[PDB]
Design a protein around this ligand. Sequence first.
Ligand SMILES: *Cc1cc2c(cc1C)nc1c(=O)[nH]c(=O)nc-1n2C[C@H](O)[C@H](O)[C@H](O)COP(=O)(O)OP(=O)(O)OC[C@H]1O[C@@H](n2cnc3c(N)ncnc32)[C@H](O)[C@@H]1O
Ligand SMILES: *Cc1cc2c(cc1C)nc1c(=O)[nH]c(=O)nc-1n2C[C@H](O)[C@H](O)[C@H](O)COP(=O)(O)OP(=O)(O)OC[C@H]1O[C@@H](n2cnc3c(N)ncnc32)[C@H](O)[C@@H]1O
Ligand SMILES: [Cl-]
Ligand SMILES: [Cl-]
Lengths: 525, 525
Amino acid sequence: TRTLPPGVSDERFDAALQRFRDVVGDKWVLSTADELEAFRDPYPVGAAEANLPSAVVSPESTEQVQDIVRIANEYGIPLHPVSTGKNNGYGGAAPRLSGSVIVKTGERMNRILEVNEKYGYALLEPGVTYFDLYEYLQSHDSGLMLDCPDLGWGSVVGNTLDRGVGYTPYGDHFMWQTGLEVVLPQGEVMRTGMGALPGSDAWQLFPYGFGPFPDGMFTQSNLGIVTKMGIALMQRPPASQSFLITFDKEEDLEQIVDIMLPLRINMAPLQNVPVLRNIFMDAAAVSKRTEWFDGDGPMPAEAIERMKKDLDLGFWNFYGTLYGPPPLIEMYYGMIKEAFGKIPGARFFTHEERDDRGGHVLQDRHKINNGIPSLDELQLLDWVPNGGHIGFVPVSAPDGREAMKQFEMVRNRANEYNKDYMATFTIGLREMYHVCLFIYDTADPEAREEILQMTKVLVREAAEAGYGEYRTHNALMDDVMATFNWGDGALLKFHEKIKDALDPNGIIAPGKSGIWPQRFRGQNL
Amino acid sequence: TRTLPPGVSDERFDAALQRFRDVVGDKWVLSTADELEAFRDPYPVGAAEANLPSAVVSPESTEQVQDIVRIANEYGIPLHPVSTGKNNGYGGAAPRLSGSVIVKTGERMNRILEVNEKYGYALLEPGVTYFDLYEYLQSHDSGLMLDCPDLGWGSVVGNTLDRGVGYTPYGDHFMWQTGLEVVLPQGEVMRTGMGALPGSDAWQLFPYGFGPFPDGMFTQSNLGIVTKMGIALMQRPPASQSFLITFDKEEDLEQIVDIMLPLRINMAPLQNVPVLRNIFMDAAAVSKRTEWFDGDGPMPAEAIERMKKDLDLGFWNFYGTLYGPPPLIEMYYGMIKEAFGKIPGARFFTHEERDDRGGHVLQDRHKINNGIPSLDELQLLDWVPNGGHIGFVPVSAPDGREAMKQFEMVRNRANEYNKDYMATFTIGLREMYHVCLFIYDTADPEAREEILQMTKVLVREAAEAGYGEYRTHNALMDDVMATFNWGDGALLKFHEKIKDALDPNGIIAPGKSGIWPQRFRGQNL
Ligand SMILES: *Cc1cc2c(cc1C)nc1c(=O)[nH]c(=O)nc-1n2C[C@H](O)[C@H](O)[C@H](O)COP(=O)(O)OP(=O)(O)OC[C@H]1O[C@@H](n2cnc3c(N)ncnc32)[C@H](O)[C@@H]1O
Ligand SMILES: *Cc1cc2c(cc1C)nc1c(=O)[nH]c(=O)nc-1n2C[C@H](O)[C@H](O)[C@H](O)COP(=O)(O)OP(=O)(O)OC[C@H]1O[C@@H](n2cnc3c(N)ncnc32)[C@H](O)[C@@H]1O
Ligand SMILES: [Cl-]
Ligand SMILES: [Cl-]
């Protein structure tokens, strides 16, 4: 059946579509079933269809965004704004609320507005991808570098707006975001920070401006449609070196984390974001599951040992990058070798020593950690046929016993739902992430349903242990928000009040982060 | 005449005071004229009285804060929450709206709730001063250090909540703030971040939690009364060295700023916040104005030269601190000497090489930049009789020509009012602050009115040139917010909608940051 916005008739939707065409042009409104297939979640969760877009609208300008938002208010049409819509693992471009119209800002709002070499920043529209920005920097012989997530095809803006992350010293994208322009839910436009001061040259220099600081309220949010965003860009160091440390035993995790923290908290000698990937992650990056095991159920111990030996990797594989003059790199690498060398069985490899099959991940991290965008990690999805993933990422204290607890409890449930445990432990400065990716056959309804049910259990069990997630998929947003319920659900009640005040007609991305406007609240959508 | 809350009769206010006494205890409510004198602005602006408190209430707990807020909602009494109320330069403890009750959270909510050595943080109530936290760290032989503003007697929490700043690598207090507990305007209590996840140990480890990030909305804000706040603490480095660079000429500012930026933007070799103080700042720290000039009008050129020669200082005096092992400090100091040594007349001094009166400021900066709180800068107020100051701090790009423009325009305007130009230029990473202090005789109604009228002009002239202030005094909040008026005042309209949604009775700090609730809007208060 044709996908319609909730409460909106075929005829009223057709009227709204024509109003959108009048704003953006006929070819920039998509509403046929075949056209919309490409905007469904590529990695669907649950057997049942969910998260169905009713249309896609591609505006060319801020003023067009304002007009789209005004039309949506008049007709009661929910809008799901995206930049590039590559939020794969968390829903892709698909809306939380079925029937919503996707506003694909990045299709035509794709300009690099400014790159400032001296102060080190960019001012971007949503359609600038990491590859686009890297191409600009390279072609202009920039002394700046970007900070990219594992895949380069997403949006510098869109990624930041979901509090996405990379792995250089500038890996906290929201931290380095500086200034934004946003269309609020009834169509008015606002600039944050020094952008609110007409004529200021400091929109991308000083984030806070004057008065209450609002920019974080537009991340993981449904309070507007962002049209411009600034971000600081780090100067490229004179040299860099990447390294891999393999650790042979599953149980080494405890000691690895307990050494990682003191080496990272002062930003030296671990200068970049530490990443500790398990053998399943690294094998999936370079091989298919059937190279190792073609049977039913969890991978047996003998097959895991074959992965390790054939790829010359450990159960846990640490990747880091060092920056600066050669003497500084040498000093820091010596400190890291001395410290992690206390773990029996640790072995060390630099990016210049190892470029075999098993070292493909090291070479990829060397690119990523130097702001060179990549799509090599798409090979993960070849682990099984029709591969897709969901991301499950609890936050905790950077404590080795806490890490072991999380490793074991997540792997136990993964085994029970017939999913491989693919995980990375990372530390920011003082916090730990358990970055779990679950890869499955997206064409199998049973596997889809298992992913949904397993991850609901993982969310609950993590919360029972005092862990909450930093980001989640459409299918889990209500459940994750429900875990943040100190003080009888005070946080969500606060967000709801703000949502209803800014969005009285309940238009923007209803249900994002579990935050529903009044007209949809308590309706099991 | 007795100061009353707007619209509240003397009899109703007396009843409300008894209600407050029943919550906090009779001795913890102040309401006599003499009791309230200490809570008036110590450094008043304008000849006419303004910013008069009606009472002070000192709660002992979050629950008492909630009860106070509920009473205030019932009676329509505005509340001005403070921590220690030492916001001198910006109004002291005094409320923006005359007649408001000051809620002095820090008098009795003064506990250090946790200092965590391994992860490097503190969880604090509002009454913990920098001196208190320093005493704790020293007495427990901590390996951590704090980051303090110039004066140590304020609140780690209160300072952060006005986006105050210090001078170590952790000088951006809000950046390092991690988690808070707040009583919202109708008395509900909420925890931000991982504090919303019951049982999480990461409240002070991971700032953002899940969903829209709100904590910045409680800074320079009137959206609640904060009762707990976390902040990260840096590890103390193994050694440190401070230095002064004297620059002889007024016009050296251009070249100094243009060298400061490249040496700071990568956080090395300028590892701490660079501060470039003019001769008036450094003289005022150690001497009275009449030592140099007792006449009418601006300070003559001959007297400026006498200050320089007597103190062995420049017109512009750069102060910095280096940290790390001795060899690292030596390397960075050599880089700094090489770079700034390109300016003719530059002279260099370490903190071990100046024991003269002129070196007093270097000794003070060496304390502050090492997280050792001080009150030595109170001597600034002895520049003139009954001395007080107001702070005027525009934000701009870290460009030497922009610095010269700001220097000249501010000094020109100050000269019209016979007020000395006391300024510091600082850089964060990519932004510049023009930290102006105007010192005046607080007992002289003509001086008070000059300061008001001068600073209103300075705000306007700065905005005309594209500079906006990062923070301001009660007297200037309406004028400063009016400068951030891109998009026909879009920013303020947004803040107003949020204020009215969270504070329907218009209770919390009306007019803070120029943000007035509906009941007071457009009333010239
Ligand atoms: C499959 C996968 C994913 C992945 C990854 C590795 C694999 C194998 N590694 C990641 C990593 O290292 N870091 C990270 O942050 N993400 C990683 N991912 C996930 C994903 O690939 C990336 O995050 C990707 O960059 C996200 O997609 P994109 O950049 O296209 O962003 P988007 O879909 O457009 O927007 C995301 C959400 O943000 C809000 N949004 C976006 N634009 C707007 C505008 N203009 N206004 C308002 N809100 C906006 C929406 O909520 C949107 O859904
Ligand atoms: C005179 C002077 C001042 C000064 C300075 C040098 C001189 C000579 N150097 C400073 C510096 O280096 N850095 C800086 O940030 N400030 C500097 N100052 C100004 C002042 O001394 C300090 O900022 C001082 O620490 C501020 O006072 P305090 O720390 O006592 O903070 P407060 O008055 O209690 O609160 C300030 C405002 O914040 C909001 N607030 C505070 N507590 C709450 C709670 N609990 N809930 C909600 N809002 C709260 C209020 O708006 C309050 O007015
Ligand atoms: Cl609006
Ligand atoms: Cl409330």
